[PDB]
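User: Hi! Is it possible to get a structure for several chains at once, not just one? Here's what I have:
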Amino acid sequence: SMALKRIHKELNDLARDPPAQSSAGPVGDDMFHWQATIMGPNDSPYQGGVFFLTIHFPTDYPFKPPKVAFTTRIYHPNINSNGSIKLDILRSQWSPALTISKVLLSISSLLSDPNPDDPLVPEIARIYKTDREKYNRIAREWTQKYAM
Amino acid sequence: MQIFVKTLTGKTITLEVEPSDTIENVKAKIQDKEGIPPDQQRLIFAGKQLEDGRTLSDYNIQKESTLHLVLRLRGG
Amino acid sequence: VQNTIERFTFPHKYKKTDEKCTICLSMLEDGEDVRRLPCMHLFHQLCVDQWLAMSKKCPICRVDIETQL
Ligand SMILES: [Zn+2]
Ligand SMILES: [Zn+2]
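Assistant: Yes, the chains can be modeled jointly so their relative placement is included. Here is the combined structure:
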């Protein structure tokens, strides 16, 4: 209810000032469920891809973080095959001053600069560390299959 | 050679090591001095986490270097 | 607890450049119950007090409300 007012405010912000490189809006008539797209950033092995996100807002948002998950497959140490994201501002580092806009920037920044030391899928992190160009090649390959 | 290990509190210890010593050897040297098990030790130098099978020279840790010691968690 | 908050922050009624509460996203207006943190950041009493019940950090800079140096 207060969460609804604040979700409405954010949407107005997206209206008045449309972000570059991302899109998000409600799913149907449900303001507590959103959908979004991220561009793969140009530095990454995901350049050229667009990744799809599903977003749920809890009833006491913004005091508790939204649930965010990829619905596009991606080769990434912190994003597993369910689309779950290991990102600090999404659990312990969440703040009621953060917005969905900044969450997307972060996820995008997470794509450009992975955190292999606290990985969600161990095997990818080991390849990321041991063999970078192995990692970037298969990331690019997954980008071509799932993200085009 | 001489190096220092530092914790989040500022607490500083000093080790004698060799450039060919491995991160496992270094962690074992920290166990001796501080009673912390190698399994609980996470070493970080110049932003990078140090891996158990590599040596100090592999990261070009040189004389009077400071490593950082934190808790190795399960993750992730 | 609530009076840990009162001992380390400044509640007051707003006198009005615009300023926005980063929690609710609405502008502060004359007479509203607001509160300032040792970081100098300002929110609506209701907005920030809800977070301070869960955390002793500033939503913006994240500095602890009991920081001193
Ligand atoms: Zn407010
Ligand atoms: Zn602050």
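The helical segments of chain C are 2-8, 45-52. Chain C touches chain A at residues 22-26, 47, 50-51, 54, 57, 59-60, 62 (CB under 8 Å).

User: Great, thank you!
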